Amino acid sequence: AETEPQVGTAQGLAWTPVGGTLLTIEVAAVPGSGKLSLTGQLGEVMKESAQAALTYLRAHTQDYGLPEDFYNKVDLHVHVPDGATPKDGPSAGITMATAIASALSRRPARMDIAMTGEVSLRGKVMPIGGVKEKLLAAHQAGIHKIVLPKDNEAQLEELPKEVLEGLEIKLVEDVGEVLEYLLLPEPTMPPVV
Amino acid sequence: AETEPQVGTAQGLAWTPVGGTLLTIEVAAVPGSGKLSLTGQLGEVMKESAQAALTYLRAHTQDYGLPEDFYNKVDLHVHVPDGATPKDGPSAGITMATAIASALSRRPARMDIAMTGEVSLRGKVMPIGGVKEKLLAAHQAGIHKI
């Protein structure tokens, strides 16, 4: 795991058949015409998950301190390292929302909280599959604060208790809970516009 | 190894299942209104590496003397000779950043220094593979600073 709060960078959990792992989404909000380049070898499901999260943020601009016309002025670029790693799936729905909001809002995203979860269009955090292996890989790297869907509450009764005595699980249902649990309430950099 | 510092050119290291092989990255910065043509039969990952390096340089224009607006004033063009070598993998990413910044800054890059390395979007240099054959082929062409 990384250690420090970064700006427009979100820590997230992945899943394989060889054991789950971490993956960070880092995005950039550079000035431009307004489009959405989605590099880092992503499947179309994760691209649509990105467009859904971005559509939710376009529908709420006065809540989270975002600039207003970031749809025809800000040329977003979503990059999921590393290359040559086919990565896709709707599971990184909350991660991309936090990353995009931290980048557009100039407020950092504290990297010592792993997260997961699928975002709707109304802002309705939906359940996922495979919570256990994501949690174990989160605990290996030394992270001790989790974000998870409220619907994922029956999935937690298969971990060891020695794992469960460390990990303090948050169980959210909507987006604004995560967006106020992962942001420092302070802008740092000058904005894009 | 070309001796003189070239403008818009970066010596690079790639490897095939023959052994190591030098690559140069010629880059032209010709006027237009903001495009990105990636010729020379590049793979997809290598194009994405070029896009990542340009996004990093768009984020950090004041650091290197890059122009004040070049997302919509300059059509860049990145050629990787020769034209019958299919090339892929994310290994060359910091050579693309070197070539693009030298072309956009007009400061000639050194050609007596080989390089390799994958690039992030924050700017981190992430580790790559095949160091052995790349440094052997950098030596046999008479390059001594890696």
Q: What does this protein look like?
A:
The PDB classes it as hydrolase. The entry lists the keywords protease, complex, proteolysis, hydrolase. Processive cleavage of substrate at individual proteolytic active sites of the Lon protease complex (conformation 3). Chains A, B are Lon protease. The organism of A, B is Meiothermus taiwanensis. The EC number of A, B is 3.4.21.53. The structure is cut from a larger assembly and holds 2 copies of chain A. Chain A has one domain (5-182): Ribosomal Protein S5, domain 2. Helices cover 24% and strands 18% of the residues of chain A. The relative contact order of chain A is 0.22. The termini of chain A are far apart. Chain A has 193 residues and is of the alpha/beta class. Chain A is globular. Chain A has 5 helices and 6 strands. In chain A, helix 1 (44-58) packs across helix 2. In chain A, the strands form 2 sheets. A 4-stranded mixed beta sheet of chain A has the order 1-2-4-3. The A-B interface holds A 6, 9, 26-28, 30-33, 37, 39-41, 75, 77, 79, 81-84 and B 44-45, 48-49, 51-52, 55-56, 58-59, 71-72, 89-90, 118, 120-122, 126.
